[PDB]
Amino acid sequence: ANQALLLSYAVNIVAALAIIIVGLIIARMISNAVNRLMISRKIDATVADFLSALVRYGIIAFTLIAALGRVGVQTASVIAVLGAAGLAVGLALQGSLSNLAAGVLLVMFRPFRAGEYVDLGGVAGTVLSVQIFSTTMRTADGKIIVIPNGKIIAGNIINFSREPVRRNEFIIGVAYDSDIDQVKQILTNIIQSEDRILKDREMTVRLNELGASSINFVVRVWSNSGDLQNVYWDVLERIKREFDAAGISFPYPQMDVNFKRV
Amino acid sequence: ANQALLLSYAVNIVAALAIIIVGLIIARMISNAVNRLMISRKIDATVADFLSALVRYGIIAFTLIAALGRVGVQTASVIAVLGAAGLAVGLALQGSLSNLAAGVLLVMFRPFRAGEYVDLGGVAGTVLSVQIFSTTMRTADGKIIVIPNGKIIAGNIINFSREPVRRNEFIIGVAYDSDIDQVKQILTNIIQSEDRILKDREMTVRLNELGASSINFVVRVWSNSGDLQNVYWDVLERIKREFDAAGISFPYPQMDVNFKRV
Amino acid sequence: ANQALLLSYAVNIVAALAIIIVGLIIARMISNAVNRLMISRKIDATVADFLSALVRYGIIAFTLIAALGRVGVQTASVIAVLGAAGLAVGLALQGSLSNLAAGVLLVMFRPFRAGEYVDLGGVAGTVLSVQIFSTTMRTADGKIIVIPNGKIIAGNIINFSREPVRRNEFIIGVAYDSDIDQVKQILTNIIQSEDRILKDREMTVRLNELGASSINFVVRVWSNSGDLQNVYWDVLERIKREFDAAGISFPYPQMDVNFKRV
Amino acid sequence: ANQALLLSYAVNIVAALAIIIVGLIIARMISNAVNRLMISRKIDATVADFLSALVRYGIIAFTLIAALGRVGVQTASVIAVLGAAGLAVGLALQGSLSNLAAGVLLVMFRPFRAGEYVDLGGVAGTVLSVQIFSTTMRTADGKIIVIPNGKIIAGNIINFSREPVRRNEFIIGVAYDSDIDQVKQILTNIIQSEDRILKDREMTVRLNELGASSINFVVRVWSNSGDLQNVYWDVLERIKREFDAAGISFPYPQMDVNFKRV
Amino acid sequence: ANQALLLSYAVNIVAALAIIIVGLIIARMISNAVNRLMISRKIDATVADFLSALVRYGIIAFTLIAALGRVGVQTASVIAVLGAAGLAVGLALQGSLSNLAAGVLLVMFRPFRAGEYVDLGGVAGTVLSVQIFSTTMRTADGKIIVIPNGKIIAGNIINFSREPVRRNEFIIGVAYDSDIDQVKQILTNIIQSEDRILKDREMTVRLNELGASSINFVVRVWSNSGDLQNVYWDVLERIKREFDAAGISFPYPQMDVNFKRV
Amino acid sequence: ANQALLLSYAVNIVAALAIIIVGLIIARMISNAVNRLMISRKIDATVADFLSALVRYGIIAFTLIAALGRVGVQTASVIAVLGAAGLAVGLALQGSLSNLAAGVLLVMFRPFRAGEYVDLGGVAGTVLSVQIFSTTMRTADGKIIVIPNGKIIAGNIINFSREPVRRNEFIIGVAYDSDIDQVKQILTNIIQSEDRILKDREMTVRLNELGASSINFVVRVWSNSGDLQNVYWDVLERIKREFDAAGISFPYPQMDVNFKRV
Amino acid sequence: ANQALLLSYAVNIVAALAIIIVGLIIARMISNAVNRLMISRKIDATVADFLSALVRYGIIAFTLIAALGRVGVQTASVIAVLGAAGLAVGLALQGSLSNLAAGVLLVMFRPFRAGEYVDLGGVAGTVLSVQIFSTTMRTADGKIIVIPNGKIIAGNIINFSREPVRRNEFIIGVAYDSDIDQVKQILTNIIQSEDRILKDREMTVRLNELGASSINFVVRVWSNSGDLQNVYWDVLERIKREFDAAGISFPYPQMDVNFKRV
Ligand SMILES: CCCCCCCCCCCCO[C@@H]1O[C@H](CO)[C@@H](O[C@H]2O[C@H](CO)[C@@H](O)[C@H](O)[C@H]2O)[C@H](O)[C@H]1O
Ligand SMILES: CCCCCCCCCCCCO[C@@H]1O[C@H](CO)[C@@H](O[C@H]2O[C@H](CO)[C@@H](O)[C@H](O)[C@H]2O)[C@H](O)[C@H]1O
Ligand SMILES: CCCCCCCCCCCCO[C@@H]1O[C@H](CO)[C@@H](O[C@H]2O[C@H](CO)[C@@H](O)[C@H](O)[C@H]2O)[C@H](O)[C@H]1O
Ligand SMILES: CCCCCCCCCCCCO[C@@H]1O[C@H](CO)[C@@H](O[C@H]2O[C@H](CO)[C@@H](O)[C@H](O)[C@H]2O)[C@H](O)[C@H]1O
Ligand SMILES: CCCCCCCCCCCCO[C@@H]1O[C@H](CO)[C@@H](O[C@H]2O[C@H](CO)[C@@H](O)[C@H](O)[C@H]2O)[C@H](O)[C@H]1O
Ligand SMILES: CCCCCCCCCCCCO[C@@H]1O[C@H](CO)[C@@H](O[C@H]2O[C@H](CO)[C@@H](O)[C@H](O)[C@H]2O)[C@H](O)[C@H]1O
Incomplete structure (x- = not known):
């Protein structure tokens, strides 16, 4: 019969809904304004969207605390419950946030670009x-x-694609009886006739290892990144043909055998 | 004999139960309304159910704090106990929440779809x-x-199934005495007669390595993802038959042996 | 001589014990009621016992805070000490809680059932x-x-036991001089005479690799999960017998030897 | 000269010491009572000692907060300092607490018992x-x-010791020219004459693999856990003797050699 | 000119210094008393020093909070700053504290002692x-x-040094044509003539594996921890001498060779 | 109709905006002053920018708390919301902050410099x-x-580039019948004729291992970091030539063979 | 026009700056005094600098809280903002603090010293x-x-350098037909003529393993840490020379070959 308290309660509820509506409006407006202000200062679009989303959710949190205080919920209750909801959303979005920050860094510093x-x-x-x-x-x-x-x-x-030039490394292995000067001279002529090998860089042709069955020569030559594989295949076929023409052997695996007829 | 305080205590208990009932009702209603509002905005159904569950448990937490305040429990006690229960439920559901978020990401961005x-x-x-x-x-x-x-x-x-086309890579190994031009010509004819090999892509037939017992030719050819394995088996049998017909050998493992009768 | 303060202290102690007793009673009753309410809604029995245990310990925590406030301990002290005891019990039960949640998930979603x-x-x-x-x-x-x-x-x-059908994969290796059509025809007849091999699935018999000493044919055939191993052993013995009858060889490891009498 | 404030300070100090003494007494009594109450309910002795130690340290913490409040230290100071001391003791005892809980679980569920x-x-x-x-x-x-x-x-x-019965697995490898029926018949007679091999279980004798130099038969037989190793050694010596008597060979590693006198 | 407020400020500063001095004195006294009380109860000296250091730093923290309150700093400020300093010292000492607790456990339970x-x-x-x-x-x-x-x-x-007795394990490998009974009899006589091998334990001499080139006998014999290595070397030399005297062979690695003059 | 409260609300809003503007101005000024004060004291530029950014964001946080208090938001709400936004920004920037600190350490202590x-x-x-x-x-x-x-x-x-001098290590392997004194004398003359090998350091030429087919001599010689590889290649070619001239052999892998015509 | 409030505000600002200046002075003085007091008690210089830096930053934090309270910022705001700045600085310095503590431990306990x-x-x-x-x-x-x-x-x-003496371990492998007593006698004479081998320690010369191609003798001898490598090389060359003079063989890898002309 006493509606006066009921009128006060309905009025407080309507005031809470009005605070919620006005708070969402002001949150969207201030967030869009901060977003335009950041984009105008050449901040990255993803960092701008992130900071604007944080500003919008913060203003919405203030609006929720105000309205829920109008309906009688205490500020400590609303802060604790919004903190639990934020901790749950953060547990769900922790890895996605790490990937978002890493993607911003990859787009900013460009360790690699598309097509590399x-x-x-x-x-x-x-x-x-x-x-x-x-x-x-x-x-x-x-x-x-x-x-x-x-x-x-x-x-x-x-x-692999950042530097204009890159180095090939052949590892030719020839028989132990092969002349070293003739091998080095043939490999040197083969890499000097190759126009795609940069003559201003290193052009090593050195005996490198005395292996189990062969002496392993090394050849290191530089070329533009686009010519690297074709130079490898061409120098390899030329090495094969010229060694076969010069009589230098590529050994099969070797094994001395001490025969003992027991 | 003095029931007036007993009447006040029973009235406070009934008011606490009434606050609990009305709070559960309002929690279910606001959560269903937020869920419909999110589904209408084309949010993912799992994210919608998650945020609606968070809103419902938050409104239930406010209702519990209000009723337990009506029975005389302090707000700090209820917040601490609900925080301990929430930390326990969160320790139980931490991994399931991580899997839920990862499943939402997999359904949204589609790194893979069913059947791939x-x-x-x-x-x-x-x-x-x-x-x-x-x-x-x-x-x-x-x-x-x-x-x-x-x-x-x-x-x-x-x-494996995203790109329409994919590359085969054969690694034929022939005897060191084999002619290189004849091997490359036979492999080229074999991959030029294969209609399922895309002629607009790369079709390498290059000497690739001077191995321990054989020179390893490489053949790289592209084909539609559905023809890849059949093209591999067909080119392999054709390589075998044509090399056997042409006299090119596939070496057995080789070994020089220096006989020493001691 | 002044017992009035002593009477007030003994009365407060008796009131604290009475609050403890009534609080344990109400905790057990509300926890059993919540447990029956969850079991009636077909919640899993372990999740029901977990949430009921949380409700019971929460009501006991409110009862402890009330009684210890009656004996003069402050609410902040009781919350801090119960929080330390809960953090200790949680450090002891952290791994057991993880295993409990994982067991609930395994019983709910059934990635595997007993006997698989x-x-x-x-x-x-x-x-x-x-x-x-x-x-x-x-x-x-x-x-x-x-x-x-x-x-x-x-x-x-x-x-291994979920799908009704599963695939065998034989890897036969025969001598390089062996006819390919005869090998494929014999393997095809062997897998066509096998009634336990599903004829509506794939039945590949393809040359697969040119190995160091043998050409490795592959045979992939599907069969019911209960016939898989018996089909493997039967097809294997049939392959052995039919190849020995047809004259096809299984090579021993091969090695060319270039004799050099030094 | 004004000792009245000095009398009040000495009286507060004596009251703090009296609260400390009475609090230690009541802590020990309530902890022993809770410990006896848990042991009477067949709780594990280690869980009983743990929960009783937690109750005793909690009552001692309330006593410290009360006495230090009597000497003028604020409740927030005592809670913060006891929380820091508890965090230090917890950092020291974290791993020992994990091992204690794991030991309680191992004694309760008995994944293994002594002597297994x-x-x-x-x-x-x-x-x-x-x-x-x-x-x-x-x-x-x-x-x-x-x-x-x-x-x-x-x-x-x-x-290894929980199940009464366990399975042996021999892997005999015989020469490719060996008869398969004779090998299977000899292995079957050898495992049928072995009384310690359970005849109601599986007794496979199947050709299993065509190896590099031998066809690998498999023999799987079950026996009581105490007879497993003796059955293995006895069946192995019997296999060796019976194969040597029957003329079946155990191959040495094989190698074809294509002689080439260059 | 108005020194009265200056007198009050200087008096508060002197009172803060006096509280600091008296608090350090009482902290050292109560910490030494707790340390003697623990050592008298046969607590470990390191645990005693740790708990006494915690009591001393706690009393010093109460003294700092009191004096800094006398100079006008609020209790919340002092608690926050001492908590930050304690968190920094704890980050520095976290690993050293873990090693200290582990060292207390190693000295208490003695998994190993010096000289083992x-x-x-x-x-x-x-x-x-x-x-x-x-x-x-x-x-x-x-x-x-x-x-x-x-x-x-x-x-x-x-x-290795806890149990008085430990087991040797020889793995003799003899030629496939070797008699099994003669090998087992020779190994049995060799381990029966060895007085340092415990005759009340196991003394297995069993054929264990049919290897690639040899049948691997196993011999397992127990001996006192101080005689283990000498028994190993003595039984090994005796095995070598007795097998060479009995005509049993230790095979060199074996290889059948199927000669093919191509 | 009653605009007086509306006037008070608009005035509070304008005062909040004025506090925000003045707070941003004072934050930028104090941060630039602290930055110049640190750069003048030769603090690293990155540490200076970091501490200045922290001072600026702290002053902005005080300004936000003041203005939001002027619009009626409580200090606890603003602290909680700014703490959540700071925890989110910190989760995004945690790894980047770790890399920033590590980069400051690498530039300060110089474990390596550019070109090394x-x-x-x-x-x-x-x-x-x-x-x-x-x-x-x-x-x-x-x-x-x-x-x-x-x-x-x-x-x-x-x-590799910090020390001026670095050591080569050759591992020559010669035939077992080779004279040891002649090998050591030839290697010693080869490393004594090499002017780029530092004679004041070690110059070991010692037999090092009795290998499966060869006795492995070791040669360890020091040289300037810029001459290391050229000295390696030159000493290697000289070793090869001088051993071939002196008749010392580099063995092929060895194998005794006990012929058995079965 | 009403400057009285403006005068109060300017006076509060000047008082805040004066509190900041006096607080920095008193912080530097108390920190230097604590540092000298610790260095006089022979605390390590790094621990002294660390604890003095903590005391200085704590006094500066009290000064900041006081001055910012004078300008109207609440204590909770200043504590929260200084806590966020401290958490950021701690995230930046966490690893450096761990390395600092580990360096203090390495300098105190000396697990290793320079030159070892x-x-x-x-x-x-x-x-x-x-x-x-x-x-x-x-x-x-x-x-x-x-x-x-x-x-x-x-x-x-x-x-490696802490103990004065260290043990060599040779692993000589000789032919199976070699006499064991002659091998042990030659190795014993070789290690008895070596003056740098400590005769009061162990000097084992025992047959250790019956290998695939050789019986592996072990020789373990102790020597001063400075003579270890020279003793190894000298005993190795002496073993080689004396075995070659005595006719004992070092086997090449062995292989029986069962010839089969198929
Ligand atoms: C009340 C505030 C509400 C809003 C903010 C919500 C924050 C939610 C925080 C959830 C817990 C985050 O805890 C985080 O866990 C990871 C686990 O690898 C750890 O740190 C991690 O950071 C990123 C993720 O951000 C990981 O990719 C990275 O591998 C690791 O360094 C730290 O422990 C902590 O950064
Ligand atoms: C009072 C609030 C009540 C409601 C909210 C309850 C929150 C409960 C939090 C429990 C602890 C979570 O702590 C979490 O642990 C994992 C352990 O790998 C770490 O971070 C982890 O996140 C996910 C799980 O979310 C893991 O799959 C991932 O491997 C890892 O990065 C961080 O340390 C923190 O994210
Ligand atoms: C005051 C509240 C009292 C009641 C609640 C008590 C809670 C007690 C919490 C103890 C600390 C839990 O901290 C937990 O540690 C593990 C360590 O792998 C991490 O997270 C872990 O979760 C589970 C265990 O739940 C592990 O099996 C999993 O490998 C890992 O992801 C996180 O850091 C955090 O989830
Ligand atoms: C104020 C309260 C005072 C009393 C209570 C004191 C509690 C002290 C807690 C110290 C920190 C514990 O933090 C713990 O660290 C381990 C590190 O592997 C992680 O979790 C760990 O739990 C156990 C130990 O309990 C480990 O054996 C396990 O490998 C891991 O899962 C979590 O991070 C957290 O459980
Ligand atoms: C309210 C304050 C707002 C401002 C400050 C915000 C701080 C945000 C903190 C986020 C969580 C940081 O938690 C951090 O996680 C990493 C996970 O490897 C762990 O520690 C880590 O530190 C660095 C990153 O700083 C890592 O590169 C490193 O591998 C590891 O040691 C610790 O758990 C903690 O240092
Ligand atoms: C408000 C206080 C302000 C001043 C104090 C600031 C403290 C800042 C703390 C940052 C987080 C530290 O969190 C730390 O992370 C590391 C991550 O490996 C973990 O512990 C670590 O300690 C050291 C670093 O101290 C690591 O080298 C070590 O590998 C690991 O044990 C713990 O999680 C925690 O010790």
């Missing part, structure tokens, strides 16, 4: 795109790999 | 379905594997 | 039972293994 | 006793191993 | 002393190893 | 630059590697 | 100096290694 062959922790292939949470790459034989950004940032990032 | 052959951390097989906590896959020989979603998201996701 | 051969992280054997903290399994030779549930849930769960 | 051969994470030997913090075991050759209980509970617990 | 050969996680050598933070051991060839106590407690502790 | 060959955790190459978050290095063959600074600081940092 | 050969976790070389954050060592061939102190303290610390 790389080697991210033992997998290797052409990069296709860095994305919000993971990087796609196509391996040499066409398989697609999707590496999460945090694993990429946490480890080494070998990059 | 993959390789999730060293296990490989056709995917069957991504589920709330774990992914099922059937390996090539019919074993079922159940990989938890967090392990899948944390590591690499090789995907 | 599995492979949980490198150990393999018939499952015997999933239990509250660990799973028992009997390996193929009769050893018992007890894997804690958390280790099982955290890793892959290969399941 | 086991394999706890790659070490194997007869168990000697489970103790409060670590398990002792004597390996087959007499070395003692002391494995902490937490490492045991965290990993697999293979148990 | 052990194997702590893959390093092995005579123990020299357990110390406050690390254990010293001298390996068999005289290198000193210093293993931190926490690494020792966390892993297995194999102990 | 190193080996950071199994990858090796010339360092190019240490940067804010990762170190770039060019391997010997031209690949670029980008190692995050925290991984570098956490592990070993081998440094 | 060691083996810290698989890297080995002469120690050069222990430093504030990392230890430098020069490997045997002149590479410099920089191991962070925490990695050193966390693992084993083998120390």
